[PDB]
Amino acid sequence: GIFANCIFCLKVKYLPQQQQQKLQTDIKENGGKFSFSLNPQCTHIILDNADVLSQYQLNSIQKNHVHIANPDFIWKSIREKRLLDVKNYDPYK
């Protein structure tokens, strides 16, 4: 699937539960994995609008080359059946 070899840290606790679950199944059904914790194996971190990252988390992200993206990155990649340009979905741009 389009998310093969992607490991997403999910920080989307302010989304409705149905959307959180749909994010998870969209990721799993398309070859990806997710965790709720940020670690060096994460390739991506998905961040809803209301969630924030500490300086520690930002330092880890930079160190491990983690891509910061909003939920639209997942939604739109699924909709277009193609992994999109994650750089177009960076809230911390």
Author numbering: 4 to 96
Paper text:
PARP4 has a distinct domain composition relative to other PARP enzymes; however, the N-terminal region of PARP4 is homologous to a collection of domains found in PARP1, a regulator of multiple nuclear processes including the cellular response to DNA damage. Collectively, the study establishes the human PARP4 BRCT as a nucleic acid–binding module.
We identified PARP4 lysine residues K23, K24, K31, and K36 as potentially important due to their vicinity to lysine residues important for PARP1 BRCT binding to DNA. A double mutant to glutamine was created for the two neighboring lysine residues (K23/24Q), thus removing both charges and potentially limiting any redundancy or compensation at this location that might have occurred with single mutants. The K23/24Q double mutant of BRCT showed very little to no evidence of binding. Our mutagenesis results led to PARP4 BRCT variants that exhibited a range of deficiencies in binding to vtRNA, with the K23/24Q double mutant resulting in complete loss of BRCT binding to vtRNA. The double mutant K23/24Q led to the most notable increase in thermal stability. We noted an additional water molecule adjacent to residue 23 when it was mutated to glutamine in the K23/24Q structure. We analyzed the mutant with the strongest phenotype, K23/24Q, in the context of the BRCT-WGR-CAT fragment of PARP4. The K23/24Q mutation was also effective at considerably reducing vtRNA interaction in the BRCT-WGR-CAT fragment, and the deficiency was comparable to that of a complete BRCT deletion. The BRCT mutant K23/24Q should serve as a valuable tool to investigate the nucleic acid–binding cellular functions of PARP4.
